[PDB]
Design a protein around this ligand. Structure first.
Ligand SMILES: [Zn+2]
Ligand SMILES: [Zn+2]
Ligand SMILES: [Zn+2]
Ligand SMILES: [Zn+2]
Lengths: 358, 350, 357, 357
């Protein structure tokens, strides 16, 4: 078993020891003498070589070599030599170092993406944008579900549309634009909007559903019930005026669902009739105050989670979480949506006080 | 003067009272009576009305009305009637500007009459330009001298397979024109290899500085911009971490240098150099997008003058394998060699 | 009317645009297009040219050309061709300096040549001022001192050889000025000013340089005299550590040395026992002077004289007494502008007659 | 250890307290009780006297005498009696100045006689500096230049006669400095610095006076070389009518010319048709100079060299480039204090904090 140093590993002196690696997977080491030894070990693995062959060129004592090795190995600073097979720039090279640095065989990862089916449930700004990122990263099959046509005002949000495209169907244009970007992938269309809960029966099985159509406000409740019942993984994305929302990513039997922690606000009108008519009116007039850069942020983090989910190389960020990114301040909130045994949508079980008999 | 209720205000009964608002501006009103009173007053304005006419129409004592009115005005829930007037493609943004208390017509104008330079059309700048083009920025200037590689197709969301071989600059111009034929775009076949290259880059409302090579590009842009009085914004990544560096504005925010610090076996020192010499960034497409988008957001805010850019005095990092957004200080330093007063005056009368 | 570009004009790309000029008169032009336009037009004038011919030659529209021309003219970056025409001129470095101030160097030289300066006290500062003036072509100097060169003076008085200890200050500096400039005429007057009346011996001159470090109130007599004689003068000296120059007095135009003086309530001291002790300590006073200070004062004082006679820019000394520190970097200015109620140059003086016509 | 009152101390009633000192070393004391006490005790020291011997003569609280003593001592109003042995001297004028700054005047002169100073470039500034340094007692002077005296030099370089045109500058300066002080030695080196590498030929000295004005970038060279060769220097010159002097670079203990910013280098245009224009305009350039400015830079420069060598006071141009305006009362200093990160004399890089999490 030959190991090799990742081309993404950086080193610098800092604190009472040093830093190994860069970005998310960066490690900080206390003992300056250990830090030296890690550098020493790392050097030996610059060329793909077995544990014994690398050791044979080290100066440090065999014992410390075993420590550094395990360290560098577990952190993914040195990786199996196989994980390095080149190919002719392979289009997805700029993504291979990323997978390596998380400890995955980049070839396994791409194969999974190539073999995945992903449904875009709703093709406004967000689904639009997720599908590009997914196509562009090698998702094999994409199913575009929508029934609207490209309007005038859509051109601010939906980064794929020309002035030339007003009037045409959303899925039509997204479909041609994804084919321009990657002709090795297959894409289908379904002329459908979820107007009633039962419409969901018409949506096909896939590895995951991307669920982002801001209307109806309660689409997620539907999608959640349906997906729990139908054993179907989904991830949700959207916005609330100027906050970008994404998550949960729901995985049947392995995570919580949208109702588990009964997190988000219940909607009510008024008990007094004369003020309820006023509320009904005000809410009928409602249009969201959106901002395209927020659109984009939710969409990209969302697409990121899908890639991890199907590529099986890292824990997606939005397991058990609804996540809000603020745009008028540096602020990220996370709502807990971990599995609840007592959820009224998934799991069969009730919540009770102890009854002490004596 | 007429006021009108913004179309972006929602209401819901909640807890001891209820909600008025929606997004980053939602408000819980705990006192039921006051909430009801707010609805009662908000209702006068679905249809434009002066303050005094609305006081007539509502049937609550002037004492209470006056609070509810200030509450509505102060949060921009009601806004001047003028701010509402068409068949306009930017009209979804208009609500956003309204909700910030601006006048959407003036914000569009400011964007129309602005000029933005993208310095580095590789990925982040790529993406930033689209967002800016589609929000109605009047003129973009594209500054790259590289060719579209096959391998760039992963990060640079504007390009077809067809496009490999062609000039980065040139493709994105036809795309921005397809998306917005009203705006004008220019190309400058230039990469920045010496400090001196920046003299070729024109004067603009702001500069977007994305490109990853050379490692000390910001340094020159900074030096240049401090003495050129040129506002600029930095953006980029560090492996899987998206970064949108400080937005610098002439003698208001302090520069990329202000917060810098003095800083820190020659057999191991030889090895660290070598290893680092071999560095290739482990980079992740959805990251470019996050940084590009927040960077583009600060630009619209900067030109639109409707709320504070997040980037003032701060370098922001968004993680991707973790939910984490850290902010780093880049506020002004008095003793800073680049933007600090190096002069002293020794003269005086009586 | 030919204009021409001054040889003291420099250009550099800087910042949003660039610099034009260099020195006291340097300018930063923030708009690149206008800077570019300024040099495009400056280029027409390297060889002499009318405004008209330069307009044709430059290929920028009339509107822009007109600004650039004015910009170049206003700052004397371009100057009348007449101011330039050599054959082989000794003063031609200064000529650039005058040009840069907007003057006609020939007229400035003339005014210098046809002037006459009295150095009233040829001990160090005066010593130095005279060389500087002789060197710039002041046509006639009159040296006024009755002292002998002592060995100790060699520290402050730059013109003197060890050889010269013994001879008359006046006499040496006269030969030294002729060595430097055989063009000019120089006169001596073996005279120290010992009481007011001595000043009647000092001749009329375009200006008087008043340096002598004693008697303490020499300035006062010179003031009295010059106010009533209509004689312009400039004071110069030191206070230990500190070089001092000005005011430069101009009859009618400026303040006199008296104008800003004040009643001084704290006369000496209260307690008689200590008052005579302060007097005793001060009686023993000897100034701690520093040679380079002599030079600073003398030089600025000489500069004001050349400007006064040359009429090309304002002397700094007008209405001001200036002090330059030496153990600290620091320049202080003190007010000496006109006072209406001043004994020396104010009125007597009232008229009580009128005719109803 | 006997103490004596400096012969340069003056006293006056002023404000709430009084003044003790006169000159840059002048002190303002507020409590009039303390003031009179200071004068009381000063009187006691007019005669060279030990602390206790002076005390007997004093009619004030023994504790109060101790404060005044410490005041007058720290400020150099009283000085050790040893500091008064001189001769019947030539440098006696300078001696009170050194006393008043708290140095043994004799220590200081010895250092001056034992110093070697290089004048790198003998234009107007170098010229004038050498005279001042010579007449102040600098033991050895090394004049480096390869020019001949021209016609037009006589306006600036206050040592040259009309009979000297044609001769080498160092030749004439050397004769003129020997007339002024034959107790000193002077060498010549026929050398102009045309390339950076010519600096290897300049001898080692206590300090270099670097005053030559061509090329504009002499100082850059001299700075690099001096940093590398461990060589103190001080720089002086002019920008048209502004007189510049400083930094004085001291190897261990000071900033260098590049420790901060100025100019960053000329830039021309990035458009070719405009670069050719600026290229031509700049080739025609001659400075607009004013001799009185020369003198100011030269004098303050010499002053700093005297302090540096005599180790008696802080030179003014440490960590500073100083501009003295001549068309107005204006002095600016640019900060050139030491940078750890300087790319000429620093061993360290500038980094942002990296926060792990
Ligand atoms: Zn559940
Ligand atoms: Zn700064
Ligand atoms: Zn008067
Ligand atoms: Zn330095």
């Amino acid at each position: 078993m030959d190991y090799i140093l990742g081309r993404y590993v950086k080193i610098a002196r800092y604190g009472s020891g040093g830093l190994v690696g860069g970005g998310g997977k960066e490690q900080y080491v206390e003992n300056l003498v250990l830090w030296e030894n890690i550098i020493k070990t790392a050097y030996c693995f610059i060329t793909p070589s077995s544990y014994t062959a690398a050791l044979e060129t080290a100066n440090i004592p065999e014992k410390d070599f075993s420590n550094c090795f395990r360290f560098l190995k577990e952190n993914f600073f040195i990786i199996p030599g196989e994980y390095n097979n080149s190919t002719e720039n392979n289009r997805y090279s700029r993504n291979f170092l990323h997978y390596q640095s998380y400890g995955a065989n980049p070839v396994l990862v791409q194969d999974k993406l190539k073999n995945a089916k992903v449904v875009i449930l709703g093709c406004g700004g967000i689904g639009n944008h997720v599908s590009v990122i997914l196509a562009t990263s090698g998702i094999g099959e994409i199913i575009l579900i929508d029934n609207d046509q490209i309007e005038n005002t859509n051109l601010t949000r939906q980064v794929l549309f020309s002035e030339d495209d007003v009037g045409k169907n959303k899925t039509e244009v997204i479909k041609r634009e994804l084919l321009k970007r990657n002709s090795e992938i297959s894409v289908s269309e379904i002329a459908l909007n979820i107007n009633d809960y039962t419409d969901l029966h018409k949506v096909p099985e896939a590895d995951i559903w991307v669920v982002s159509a801001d209307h109806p406000f309660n689409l997620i409740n539907w999608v959640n019930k349906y997906c729990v019942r139908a054993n179907q993984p989904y991830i949700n994305a959207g916005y609330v005026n100027d906050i970008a929302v994404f998550g949960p990513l729901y995985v049947p039997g392995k995570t919580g669902c949208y109702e588990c922690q009964k997190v988000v606000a219940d909607l009510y009108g008024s008990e007094k009739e004369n003020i309820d008519h006023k509320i009904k009116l005000i809410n009928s007039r409602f249009k969201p105050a959106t901002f395209a850069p927020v659109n984009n942020v939710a969409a990209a983090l969302c697409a990121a989670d899908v890639i991890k989910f199907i590529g099986k190389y890292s824990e997606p960020l939005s397991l058990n979480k609804r996540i809000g990114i603020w745009s008028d301040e540096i602020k990220i909130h996370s709502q807990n949506m971990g599995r609840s045994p007592v959820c009224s949508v998934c799991g069969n079980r009730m919540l009770e006080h102890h009854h002490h008999h004596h």
